[PDB]
Amino acid sequence: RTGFYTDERTFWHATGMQALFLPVGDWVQPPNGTAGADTPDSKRRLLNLAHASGLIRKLTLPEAIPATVEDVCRVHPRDYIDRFKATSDAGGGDLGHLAPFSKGGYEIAMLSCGLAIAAVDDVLSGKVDNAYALCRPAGHHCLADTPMGFCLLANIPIAIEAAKARHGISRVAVVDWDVHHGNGTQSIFYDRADVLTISIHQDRCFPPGYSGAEDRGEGAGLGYNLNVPLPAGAGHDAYVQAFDDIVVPALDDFKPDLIIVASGLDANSVDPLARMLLHSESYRLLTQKMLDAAARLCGGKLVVVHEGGYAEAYVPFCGHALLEALSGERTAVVDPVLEMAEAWQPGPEAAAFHRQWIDRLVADLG
Amino acid sequence: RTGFYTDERTFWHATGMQALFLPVGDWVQPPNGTAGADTPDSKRRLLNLAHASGLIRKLTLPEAIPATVEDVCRVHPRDYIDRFKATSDAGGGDLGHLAPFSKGGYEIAMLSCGLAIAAVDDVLSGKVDNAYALCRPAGHHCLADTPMGFCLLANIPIAIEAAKARHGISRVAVVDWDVHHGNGTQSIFYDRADVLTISIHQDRCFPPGYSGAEDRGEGAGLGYNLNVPLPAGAGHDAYVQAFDDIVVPALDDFKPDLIIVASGLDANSVDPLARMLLHSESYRLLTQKMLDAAARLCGGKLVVVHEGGYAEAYVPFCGHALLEALSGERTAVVDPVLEMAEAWQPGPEAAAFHRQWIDRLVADLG
Amino acid sequence: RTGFYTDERTFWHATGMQALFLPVGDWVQPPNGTAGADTPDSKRRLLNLAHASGLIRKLTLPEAIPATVEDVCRVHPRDYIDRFKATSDAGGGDLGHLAPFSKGGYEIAMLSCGLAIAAVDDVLSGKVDNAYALCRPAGHHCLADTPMGFCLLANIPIAIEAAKARHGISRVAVVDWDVHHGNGTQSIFYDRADVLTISIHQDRCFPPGYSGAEDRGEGAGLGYNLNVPLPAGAGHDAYVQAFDDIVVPALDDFKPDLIIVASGLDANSVDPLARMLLHSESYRLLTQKMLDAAARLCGGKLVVVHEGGYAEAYVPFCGHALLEALSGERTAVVDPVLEMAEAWQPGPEAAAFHRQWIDRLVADLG
Amino acid sequence: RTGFYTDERTFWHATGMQALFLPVGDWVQPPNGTAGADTPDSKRRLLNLAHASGLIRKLTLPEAIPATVEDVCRVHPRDYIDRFKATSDAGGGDLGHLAPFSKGGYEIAMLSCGLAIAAVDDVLSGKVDNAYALCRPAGHHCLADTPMGFCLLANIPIAIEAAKARHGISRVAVVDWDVHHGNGTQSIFYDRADVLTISIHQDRCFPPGYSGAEDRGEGAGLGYNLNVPLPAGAGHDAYVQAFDDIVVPALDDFKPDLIIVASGLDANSVDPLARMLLHSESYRLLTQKMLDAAARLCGGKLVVVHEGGYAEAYVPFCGHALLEALSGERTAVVDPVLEMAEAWQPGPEAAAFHRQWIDRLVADLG
Numbered sequence A, B, C, D: 001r002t003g004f005y006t007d008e009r010t011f012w013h014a015t016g017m018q019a020l021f022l023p024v025g026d027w028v029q030p031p032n033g034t035a036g037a038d039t040p041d042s043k044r045r046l047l048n049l050a051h052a053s054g055l056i057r058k059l060t061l062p063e064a065i066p067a068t069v070e071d072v073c074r075v076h077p078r079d080y081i082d083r084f085k086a087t088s089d090a091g092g093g094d095l096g097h098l099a100p101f102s103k104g105g106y107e108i109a110m111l112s113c114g115l116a117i118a119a120v121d122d123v124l125s126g127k128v129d130n131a132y133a134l135c136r137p138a139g140h141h142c143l144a145d146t147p148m149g150f151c152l153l154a155n156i157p158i159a160i161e162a163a164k165a166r167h168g169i170s171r172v173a174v175v176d177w178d179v180h181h182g183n184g185t186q187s188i189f190y191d192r193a194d195v196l197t198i199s200i201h202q203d204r205c206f207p208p209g210y211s212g213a214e215d216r217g218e219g220a221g222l223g224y225n226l227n228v229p230l231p232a233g234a235g236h237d238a239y240v241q242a243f244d245d246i247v248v249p250a251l252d253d254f255k256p257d258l259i260i261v262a263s264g265l266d267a268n269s270v271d272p273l274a275r276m277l278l279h280s281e282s283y284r285l286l287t288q289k290m291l292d293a294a295a296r297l298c299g300g301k302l303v304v305v306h307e308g309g310y311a312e313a314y315v316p317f318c319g320h321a322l323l324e325a326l327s328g329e330r331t332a333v334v335d336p337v338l339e340m341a342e343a344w345q346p347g348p349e350a351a352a353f354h355r356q357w358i359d360r361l362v363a364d365l366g
């Protein structure tokens, strides 16, 4: 059984008047359509398609339980949380780097975080075999005291520290396949060996200029952070090989008691915020690889937490195939972009380059 | 002096109710924002920024002259033009492959085509040194009998045939740096040596699966078509080397009497419809290379014709830098994405791959 | 217990590329925002608010069962249904007057109709005490052979004829407070005494020019149709008096076995498609009058069926107060427009005119 | 010769993240389409249609020159101007009641104001016979120290005080047919006899609850302010009579040297922000009454200044007929809503009430 953790009010968070990610003003003309990049529909349309296909009726949807302040302050200093609340009450703002929010965004962020907490809690309790948390706002860029890149709270780290306090879990692996670097997760556990943090991301995209393969942790955490930068334009076969040659072997060696996927859908082939070429069947297969790892390593315990994804028209098909895999349910959904996205895939010269790139990352892991 | 060819009604063309490029229906939910991918604002926002900067007041803007049926039938069979008009009167439709239009789309396509005809005409007659035509709908995928990929009339080929009839021009080169393959231009002049057709495009993107480096023309046109596919994820340095090592030498060898650029802006770093990493200063520099080529080979005679470009927030900055180069004008516009897009650029390993790719294209040309 | 009948796919119906209700083309520029007037969000935002307030958790939400062909053919000729299905399969169209739809609109209309059928069926069988059907597309303008005014099937009449076939109910009253005339309901039952059809509507609005107070039925149906036109600019007190002096006495005289409210929310104070001045507490009060009537006349059997409503920002508050009344529940929702809409209400001179108007309608009823 | 005063950057002002006029947060869900009520397109679409019809080519369009600090401080205290600029430099805000703006909103307000200043200046200097200023943001609610109701500077009063300085003009009449009360204009000149301020508006609409027929000025201004409240639901014949029986006689008695119309188009039949029933031919006729008055009283000197208007689909046709009248030009534009709006007009009983209402206003004027 699969739990699906969602709440209407996560779709009411609004980043404000931006054209894509550009703040209005100076030379940036206001948009005439939907404002922003992290739009409500770039996440709701996934849920909409899961309703329309009949898939949601196969899942269990618990009522949302917001994070408490005690929950979030296992990661964040209370001063940040207090300033967040005060700014949110006053009409919204931005307390970090590219992390805007509107009035009431504090309550919505606390709610979104609670979806991740409860998804992990219910999987560890045996209430469901696995779970999907449709978080919005996302979490994986948020530092302990600095929100960034549309992330206002560290959703997954907070869910992990709650699981440690409630269940005493020893080892957790986070597999971050959102197309951007999970710098928040990396930072929060950088000197710890009990959380393996893996990030696969477009080389140099966000944070801009960052690659990170050499950043493997510090102190007790040395060897427990793993960055897999991939070149812009990499597609299905590049991601499959990175998972076969790097990600899955890392999980096997670490022996986690729980696997958490930070699942952004923005490596899809038409996303504006990156340059990758994944399609809906890429996400099905990557999910199947994680289902296999969780079955082999930690009794099936697998939690998928929504992060990025900005192509409103194509994110739903990528997320829906993921959910079909997670739940083991077949529906009648047909991805109308798949044939073209398969034709888009890199040819042999690019494929050789991607294979050589991943071989080098493996060799450098020693 | 730069002429700028535009008309309000080009922004009234509407592709219909699609989510991005996906027709609504079946599993595709209707969009709540702007419908379509070729949206009015993905072109109008370029014009808006050039007004706001003061650039437009330095250009000359002739009143638009629509193409006549006689003009367009120098390329298209009258039967296609007649069916286009009848379908447009009847409420719109799609007479080709991914070329939808609404009621009245026939008249707007004829108007758009007339912007290209007149821009070429005015440069050849000496009224302006160079020109930019803000065509919408675009033209470079349209075959003689089949519209395709948002292109309903073969804008540049029709403008070329009109210039041959009115001015007797002998040799024309078309430099197509829209991110997609200019298959319409290639097809229409494929057996002809009087028009050199060059397309730089994302490998396998649109038409899907097509690369085309070996397709060099046929009969008298053998050696007068030149495809430069580039891998997904290529950016500024790759395009610059492609122009220095392939495009500009091809122009030098051909000795054109007029250079026409098919300028789509969809190779920009955040376009949803391709995977490339150009930024606004890429377009400025590529335009300077074309201005230099025209100055050396054909008395400065250079026409730039708008094609694709789908990132509403970033296309304006790319086109504005292009227009500053074309006109030689300075404004106070600053691209707020430029620093980040510079950081996004491919690192050393990908750069070596791009150089190996272009070196192979050069070697294959003999 | 209140049943709430909704299905995700009702929000996927799309009227097409119109600016408000105006088809694109000729002098109508395409919209840059949401296309259309009957937008998905003009109905979904009511459901969104009911989720956010916690009210949906207090209701029972049965799974949708679409109308069958047998159901809809109790009202519509099979030829209409077949041409609708064939046009829908082929990409959508408009088979009547201002009733456009997209590919697959047939199945969505059959589903929307099933919400009304099930709401009536479940109230008559005692599964719920009363019910709300969030129909989209709406039904009350649809004639037996002709769709019109955004209405593709005659939702309420189909649900009535189904109820007669499955429960043998003798007398049904329809109270239509959508701001436009329920010409479809009026036509379908015009010569019948077993369905009392009451419409309160803005004088001359839609169908344009129609008032209708003298159209009281024909044959056996003479005295069983009741039109209550109200002048543009009428508000809360005018509607309340119309219900106290005309609508409720007609219900009392008729002795229905079931009351169905055709509930459009477009008499609200900021609707673009009418000129009325109702606010959220108007809808609470009018709903309470129908609850009281149903308690007194037919054992509490009350069904409310969504029709029109076009102000996306204010329809939610009006419908939410209606749902609070229907379910007898209170939430923390506060209407932020209420104070201003109360200040907007007609003053003493206009109020005297409205009383004079309603008194004339009463006197004419003999 | 008609001057048309417009600048691209007036369409870049953005009120922010509101659903219609409701700020997001608490119970107001963010919009998925265009944010706000005063949207860019609610004004630009009028300009767009005037381009498409060919009418703009018949007008003279001078380059905009913004208001100076000296210009605006003839009306506003320097402290307000300084706080406006500081807030705008720092990201936007709202310094009054329902007057939000974005970053750089100060420069755009100064530019908008300069359009009105120049339109008045050029008519008085004889450069054009009459003029239309497409102001955005609007002006007529702004008080000397408090912005209000989407108005950030007192556009028309600033233009008048500039005309007194530059031309020494003695008497100006302002005729405000925006559907809301021109409380800014009324307040600024309330004790002055050299400016006659007339406002026709929906009774009690905005400012909410205000009617004002008894507020006729104070001191030297007693008799030089004239409020004409009209009931909600009034249409063409009611406005025509108000102008024949009240407005034009007031102009004839006052003997102005210049007539300025504060032209909001929000009395149109489908505006969300009022309940009136004007159509495009109403605005043509009211403009002709003002042209006739200016020719009779002040040598043709007539300036029309855009204020409100929120129906994006219908405002263009209303303003376009206004511009045809003002310029004395005919185009091929046909209003596709006209026939329906004519059928919507009040019937005989409502028409008698409107006539009695206006007779009463006249009687109270003594």
Ligand SMILES: O=C(CCCCCCC(=O)Nc1ccccc1)NO
Binding pocket: A336, A337, A340, B021, B022, B023, B098, B138, B141, B149, B150, B178, B180, B206, B264, B266, B273, B307, B308, B309
């Ligand atoms: O040159 C061009 C044309 C770009 C076309 C982009 C590809 C869109 C496409 O192929 N869409 C589609 C695919 C399958 C089914 C429906 C639509 N734009 O600048």
Ligand SMILES: O=C(CCCCCCC(=O)Nc1ccccc1)NO
Binding pocket: C336, C340, D021, D022, D023, D098, D138, D141, D149, D150, D178, D180, D206, D264, D266, D273, D307, D308, D309
């Ligand atoms: O002249 C004008 C101003 C119209 C302003 C109408 C806005 C309505 C309003 O005041 N709304 C509101 C009230 C309280 C809280 C939030 C919004 N427009 O043309």
Ligand SMILES: CCCCCCCC(=O)O
Binding pocket: A021, A098, A138, A141, A149, A150, A178, A180, A206, A264, A266, A273, A307, A308, A309
């Ligand atoms: C490209 C500029 C901003 C990108 C933010 C990325 C957030 C995410 O991880 O989805």
Ligand SMILES: CCCCCCCC(=O)O
Binding pocket: C021, C098, C138, C141, C149, C150, C178, C180, C206, C264, C266, C273, C307, C308, C309
């Ligand atoms: C053009 C104004 C009215 C159009 C049809 C409205 C249908 C309804 O909601 O009843």
Ligand SMILES: [K+]
Binding pocket: A176, A177, A178, A179, A180, A181, A182, A199, A200, A201
């Ligand atoms: K990642």
Ligand SMILES: [K+]
Binding pocket: B176, B177, B178, B179, B180, B181, B182, B199, B200, B201
């Ligand atoms: K190309």
Ligand SMILES: [K+]
Binding pocket: C176, C177, C178, C179, C180, C181, C182, C199, C200, C201
């Ligand atoms: K009605």
Ligand SMILES: [K+]
Binding pocket: D176, D177, D178, D179, D180, D181, D182, D199, D200, D201
């Ligand atoms: K007014």
Ligand SMILES: [Zn+2]
Binding pocket: A178, A179, A180, A264, A266, A307, A308, A309
């Ligand atoms: Zn991301």
Ligand SMILES: [Zn+2]
Binding pocket: B178, B179, B180, B264, B266, B307, B308, B309
């Ligand atoms: Zn293209």
Ligand SMILES: [Zn+2]
Binding pocket: C178, C179, C180, C264, C266, C307, C308, C309
């Ligand atoms: Zn209605």
Ligand SMILES: [Zn+2]
Binding pocket: D178, D179, D180, D264, D266, D307, D308, D309
């Ligand atoms: Zn107004």
